[PDB]
Amino acid sequence: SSLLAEFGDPITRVENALQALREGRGVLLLDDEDRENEGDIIYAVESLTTAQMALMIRECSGIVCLCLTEAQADRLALPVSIEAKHGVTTGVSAQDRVTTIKTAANPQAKPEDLARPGHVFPLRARAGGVLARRGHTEGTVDLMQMAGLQPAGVLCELTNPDGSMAKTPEIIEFGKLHNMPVLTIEDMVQYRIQFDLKL
Amino acid sequence: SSLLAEFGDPITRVENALQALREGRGVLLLDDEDRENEGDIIYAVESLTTAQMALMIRECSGIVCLCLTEAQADRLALPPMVTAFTVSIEAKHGVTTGVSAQDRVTTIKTAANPQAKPEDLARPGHVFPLRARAGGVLARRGHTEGTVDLMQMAGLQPAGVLCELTNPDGSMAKTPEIIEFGKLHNMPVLTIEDMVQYRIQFDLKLA
C-alpha cells in the first residue's frame, strides 16, 4: 500500500485538500508519492492569518513565497522581492508578511502599493497550471482556483528541527499532527484531466 | 539601570562578543539599548555549522543573510538588487534544493571563500547577500556593517551571517526577548552604539 494511501486515493486527497482550503485551513503538497520528496505547507491568501504565517516561520524554511497568476503579477508590474508600501515596519514579522501578501494579491492592487525589494517572494504560475508545468507554484494557484478561492496562495518548505528538509514520511506525520490534508501534484494532474478542469 | 546592564558596560559587551565569535559561538546585535529595537543572531562564517544554521532557521525569520565586504561582494559580481540587498544566491555544486541548513552553509562558505569566483554561484537562490559599507558602523549604523565589523575586529574571515530573532507567535523579538534569549543560550548581547564607542575609543580603522 502506497505512502499516502491512508489519506485516501488520489481523487479523495485532492477533494479533502480543496475542502480544507475552503474552510480556511492549510495543506501539504508533494510532487508525488516518492518517499524522498520534500514538501511545502500551503495556505490560501484569502483566509490567511497572522497565526498561520507564524506557524510557517516556525516550522518551515522562512523563505515564504507568494504564488500568483501571470495576470496579478502583471497588475503589480512584477518582472523581485516585495514589501507593502504602507502598514508595515521591518517587513519580517508574521503580521507584516501577511499585510504585504494581502496587499500584493489584492485584485484592485496598483504597483505603487508595494515597495521593492522586500521580505516576501512572489512567484508567477505558468498558464495551464500543473497540466503545463508540475511545479509547486502551479499546484498552489491551481488549488485556489479549483477551490473557488482568490487565485493566490502562500507556500514554504517544511523543515525538520535539525535543519534538514522534511521528506514524505515527515510531511505525512506533520499533516496528521496538524490535521492538514496531504496531496501530490500527480494527484492534481489526474484530477484536473478526469474532471476536464480548464481553469 | 540600562536594559543591557547584565551584559556589562558597553566596552565589556563588545569584548565578550568578540571572544564568543573567536570561540565559534554566536552573538545578538541591537541598534542600541532602546526597548523597541529588534535584534539579530550573528554567527561567524569561518566557524559556521549546520547546527548553528538550523537554530537560525528554527528561531529566526528564516531569511538568513550573508554580510560581505565590498571587496568580496565585487569578487562575486553581486551588484545592488534594484540598496544593500543583492540577488539571492545558491552554491552551484554540493547542494540540492539549497534550502536545508547544510545547503545554506555550503552556499555561504562557497560565497565567502576568498578565492571564490562569480561562477561558483547560481542566482537566484536561498541565501541573501548584503553589502557592508566601507567604514563599517562608523560610516553606517546598520546590522550589516555591525556583522562585518565584528568579524574584522575579532580577526576572523570578514564575513558573517545574520537573522532576525522571531518570537513563537510571529512577532519580532525586541530587546527584552533578545536579552532573555542571550542569557538562555550563553550568547553575548551588544549594540551598534557599543561598537561605535569601542571603535573610536580604540582608534580602530579596519579597512
* Residue A6 CA, distance from chain mean position: 23
Q: What is the DSSP letter of B100?
A: S
Neighboring chain B residues of A120 at a CB cutoff of 8 Å: none
Residue ranges for the known binding site of A for Mg(2+) are: 36, 136
CA-based torsion, B8, B14, B15, B17: positive or negative: positive
- Mark the breaks in chain B: residue after which each occurs, C to N over 2.5 Å: 82
Given phi > 0 = left and psi -120 to 50 = alpha, else beta, which region is B8?
left
Q: Whole-angstrom Cα distance, residue B156 to residue B189?
A: 19
- The set of cell numbers assigned to A100 is 504585504
The SS3 call for residue A109 is: coil
Solved how? X-ray
- Tell me phi and psi for residue B147, to 5 degrees: -65, -55
Dihedral of the alpha carbons of B3, B6, B8, B14, in degrees to the nearest 10: -80
Alpha carbon of residue A52 to chain centroid: 12
DSSP state of A134: -
Residue of A nearest to B83 (CA): A117
Distance from C-alpha of A124 to C-alpha of A74, rounded to nearest angstrom: 9
Length of chain B: 207
Which amino acid makes up residue A88? V
Long-range pairs of B150-154 with CB within 8 A, sequence gap ≥ 24: B150/B17, B150/B18, B150/B21, B150/B27, B150/B29, B150/B42, B150/B195, B151/B21, B151/B44, B151/B45, B151/B46, B152/B206, B153/B14, B153/B18, B153/B195, B153/B198, B153/B199, B153/B204, B153/B206, B154/B18, B154/B19, B154/B21, B154/B22, B154/B44
SS3 A155: strand
Q: Under DSSP, is residue B36 helix (H, G, I), strand (E, B) or coil?
A: coil
Beta-carbon contacts of B62 under 8 Å, excluding residues fewer than 6 positions away, are A57, A60, A61, A62, A63, A64, B56, B163
How far is Cα A135 from Cα B126, in angstroms, rounded to an integer?
17
| Radius of gyration of the CA atoms of chain B, in A | 16
Q: Is B8 helix (H, G, I), strand (E, B) or coil?
A: coil
CB contact under 8 A, A61 and B61: no
d(CA B90, CA A167): 21
- The CB-side HSE value for A9 (13 A sphere, CA atoms) comes to 3
Q: Which residues contact A54 (CB under 8 A, 6 or more apart)?
A: A94, B168, B169, B170
Instruction: Give dist(CA B35, CA B33) in Å, integer.
Output: 6
CA distance B178 to B165: 8
The H helix count followed by the E strand count for chain B is: 7, 7
Element containing residue A29 per DSSP (H, E): strand A27-30
Distances in Å between the Cα of B160 and the Cα atoms of B23, B69, B82, B121, B200 are: 14, 10, 23, 18, 22
Domains and CATH numbers, chain B: 1-207 (3.90.870.10)
On whether the CB atoms of residues B159 and B26 are closer than 8 A, the answer is no
Q: Which residues of B touch A61 (CB under 8 A)?
A: 57, 62, 99, 126
∠ Cα B142 B145 B148 (to 5°)? 150
Closest Cβ opposite residue A165 in set B83, B100, B168: B100
Contact between A37 and A30 (Cβ < 8 Å): yes
Q: For residue A196, give every residue at least 6 positions away whose Cβ sits within 8 Å of its Cβ, in sequence order, or none.
A: none
Q: In whole angstroms, give the CA distance from residue A9 to residue A3.
A: 11
- Angle B10-B11-B15 (CA atoms, 0-180°, nearest 5)? 120
Sheet strands (E) in B45-191 = 65-68, 89-91, 121-131, 159-164, 189-191
Q: Where do we find the cell 543572531?
A: B41
Contacts of B36 (CB under 8 A, 6+ apart): B174, B175
Residues across chain A: 199
Q: After which residues is chain A broken (C to N over 2.5 A)?
A: 79
CA angle B34/B40/B44 to nearest 5° reads 135
Tell me, what DSSP letter sits at residue A89?
A: S
- Identify residues of A whose CB sits under 8 angstroms from chain B CBs: 38, 50-51, 53-54, 57-58, 60-64, 80-81, 90, 92-95, 116-117, 119, 157, 159, 161-165
Provide the edge-to-edge strand list for the sheet that holds A40-44: A82-84, A114-124, A65-68, A153-157, A40-44, A27-30, A182-184
Gap between the Cα atoms of B76 and A177, Å rounded: 43
Residues 6 or more apart whose Cβ sits within 8 Å of residue B103: B91, B95, B96, B97, B126
Please name which of B11, B17, B16, B21 lies closest in space to residue B156, comparing C-alpha atoms: B21
* Cβ(B201)–Cβ(B11) below 8 Å: yes
Q: What share of chain B is helix, strand, coil (3-state, %, to 5)?
A: 40, 20, 40
